[PDB]
């Protein structure tokens, strides 16, 4: 399956090692993924169906 960016929908070349969120590029990472509040990364992964937290 093709991997996509979790917040922007583009080609997700990179995935963060902390919260397992696939992001597009550097601006996306430093503006969204790093300042992301806890408890919403599972909300992002629910759309991909990997809301691991149960």
């Amino acid at each position: 399956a093709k991997k996509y960016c979790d917040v922007t929908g583009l080609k997700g070349f990179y995935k963060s090692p902390t919260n397992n969120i696939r992001y597009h590029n550097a601006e996306i990472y430093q503006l969204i993924v790093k300042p992301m509040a806890p408890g919403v990364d599972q909300e992002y992964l629910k759309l991909r169906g990997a809301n691991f937290v149960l």
């Binding site: 399956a1 093709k2 991997k3 995935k15």
Partner: protein, 437 residues
């Protein structure tokens, strides 16, 4: 934009259909008799009948002999082979000089082979090798796939061994040519790019065309291409090796037996109508540097049945033949060889045709020159030499450019004349000074 060399302005002989010569056509001006002689010569070459013809062009330096050779070269067209050559190039340190002359002789004879190129492009969806022993695979069934569709092929053991050479797996874009059998692996497909996040497999996209593409080509080879193809001291010319062989092969004396066998095979292919024979022109510029031994071998080799039209050019007068001591001869050509030749004379020029030459080379190199500047350049060309004016067209344009102008005026011409010196003025400076200029 295109580069301009010395002979870019000349396109051809500029002759009419009736054989007469127009005064200003084809990049030529004047020289009507030698142009008509070379037109008769190119009609002889296009007749494709006779072998071993020779023509010597006689005339002073800067009279347009190599211009006539290039005009002959374009008049024959790209179909007819042409091997222009300096007379100094025959003296080689790997192989003897006569064998280099005979190599150039074979180089001036060419073939045409019509062949078709059918190819298969796309992704390996399936690869099922059927063994059918009789440990040895009988055949392999490979299915290819592109954007316009898919197509299944049946392949022999040798293409399967070439596939295993290229390390082709399922999902790799390949290249298969049906006639030759070349197998080239372009890379893994784009749909298989996310199996791993990072791997060495170069992911090329799927081809947008049909899998099967067929087109026809024409292969222009010469006889010498064939003789160096099947006479290798160390074989293996077919295998692609980016790093070379461990022993460098040396150029060797190719025997008459291989020439006879290549001639027999080429005649067999022509009699089937596969190949067409196009005789060409071997042009030897500055024949006066040829040794007497090359002249003797040329005397022998102008009698062969497959020899091309040989064009020689010289500018010397009563000169000693190279390699001799007391043999004076016209144009440095020994008198036995000059009986076989047809000498065409080349005349010098005067002021008006020098002016038309200079404005043609101004027009081709797209510098705008003023009229009185052109008259000064023509007068200076008549005084010094022609090629000095031809080589000082471009610094005049440079000095006009640095003064933010597009038209060359007289002051640029005097500035270039003061900066750059001809042979006579530099010789005058050379004679007066004592300490090595």
């Amino acid at each position: 934009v295109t580069r301009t060399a010395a002979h870019t302005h000349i396109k051809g002989l500029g002759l009419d259909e009736s054989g007469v010569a127009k005064r200003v056509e084809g990049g030529f001006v004047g020289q009507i008799e030698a142009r008509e002689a070379c037109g008769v010569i190119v009609d002889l070459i296009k007749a494709k009948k006779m072998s071993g013809r020779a023509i010597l062009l006689a005339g002073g330096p800067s009279t347009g002999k190599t211009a006539l050779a290039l005009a002959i070269s374009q008049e024959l067209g790209p179909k007819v082979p042409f091997c222009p050559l300096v007379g100094s190039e025959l003296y080689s340190v790997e192989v003897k000089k006569t064998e280099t002359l005979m190599e150039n002789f074979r180089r001036a004879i060419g073939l045409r082979i019509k062949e078709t190129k059918e190819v298969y492009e796309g992704e390996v969806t399936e690869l099922t090798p059927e063994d059918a022993e009789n440990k040895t695979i009988s055949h392999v069934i490979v299915g290819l796939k592109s954007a316009k569709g898919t197509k299944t092929l049946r392949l022999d053991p040798t293409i399967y061994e070439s596939i295993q050479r290229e390390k082709v797996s399922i999902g790799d874009v390949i290249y298969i040519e049906a006639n030759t059998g070349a197998v080239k692996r372009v890379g893994r497909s784009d749909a298989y790019a996310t199996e791993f996040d990072l791997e060495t497999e170069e992911y090329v996209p799927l081809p947008k065309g049909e899998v099967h593409k067929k087109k026809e080509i024409v292969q222009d080879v010469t006889l010498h291409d064939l003789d160096v193809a099947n006479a290798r001291p160390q074989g293996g010319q077919d295998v692609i090796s980016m790093m070379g062989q461990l022993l460098k092969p040396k150029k060797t004396e190719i025997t008459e037996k291989l020439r006879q066998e290549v001639n027999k095979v080429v005649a067999k292919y022509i009699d089937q109508g596969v190949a067409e024979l196009i005789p060409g022109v071997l042009f030897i510029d500055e024949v006066n540097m040829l040794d007497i031994e090359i002249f003797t071998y040329l005397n022998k080799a102008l009698e062969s049945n497959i020899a091309p039209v040989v064009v020689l050019a010289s500018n010397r007068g009563m000169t000693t033949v190279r390699g001799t001591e007391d043999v004076i001869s016209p144009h440095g050509v020994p008198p036995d060889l000059i009986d076989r030749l047809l000498i065409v004379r080349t005349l010098p020029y005067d002021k008006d045709e020098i002016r038309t030459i200079i404005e043609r080379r101004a027009t081709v190199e797209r510098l705008q020159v003023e009229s009185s500047a052109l008259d000064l350049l023509a007068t200076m060309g008549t005084e010094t030499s022609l090629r000095y004016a031809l080589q000082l067209l471009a610094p005049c344009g440079i000095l006009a450019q640095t003064s933010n102008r597009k038209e060359i005026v007289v002051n640029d011409v005097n500035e270039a004349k003061l900066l750059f010196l001809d042979a006579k003025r530099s010789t005058k400076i050379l004679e007066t000074s004592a300490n090595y200029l």
